[PDB]
């Protein structure tokens with residue numbers, strides 16, 4: 001069970017996707033972290049530069065980690081479990097269409113999914129859970145953590 005033994009975690013958005021504005025990208029990312037926050041003791045702080053616990057980058061194909069991305073559709077992103085260095089980090093395929101809408105793919109929902117992984121959650125078999133292996137759009141306005149996911153971080157932390 002890898003878990004962060006610290007509660008306030010910093011994150012850094014290393015670059016951006018041209019699909020969305022930077023403000024929309026930053027809002028998608030911020031709201032995704034807030035979901036886990038309201039159900040756990042973790043507090044997340046954005047830093048503009050510098051080492052951050054959770055680095056967030058939009059990369060393409062080979063991007064230095066032995067987990068190359070694959071062009072449109074297919075794998076949308078991946079994150080690493082709690083740890084130093086790459087631990088906790090989250091990469092998004094820069095080749096996907098990232099959206100703010102119901103169109104494929106909504107960055108907020110994919111981000112929320114990746115962060116569960118950065119906090120030490122794996123995939124759930126529950127199709128209604130956010131940690132479900134495959135993406136499905138769900139209304140994002142006043143969006144809240146499904147009970148399955150709530151049970152998962154709460155079993156890791158408090």
Ligand SMILES: CC(C)C[C@H](C(=O)NO)C(=O)N[C@@H](C)C(=O)NCC(N)=O
Pocket residue numbers: 074075076077078079109110113114117130131132133134135136
């Ligand atoms: C290549 C492996 C790690 C699959 C990858 C994933 O689950 N990352 O957490 C992924 O892109 N899964 C697809 C099926 C996806 O839509 N994931 C994000 C989602 N659940 O929102």
Ligand SMILES: [Ca+2]
Pocket residue numbers: 052053054055083084085086087088089
């Ligand atoms: Ca890290």
Ligand SMILES: [Ca+2]
Pocket residue numbers: 069070071072073074075076093095096
């Ligand atoms: Ca892809």
Ligand SMILES: [Zn+2]
Pocket residue numbers: 059063065067078091
């Ligand atoms: Zn990667």
Ligand SMILES: [Zn+2]
Pocket residue numbers: 113114117123133
């Ligand atoms: Zn996943």
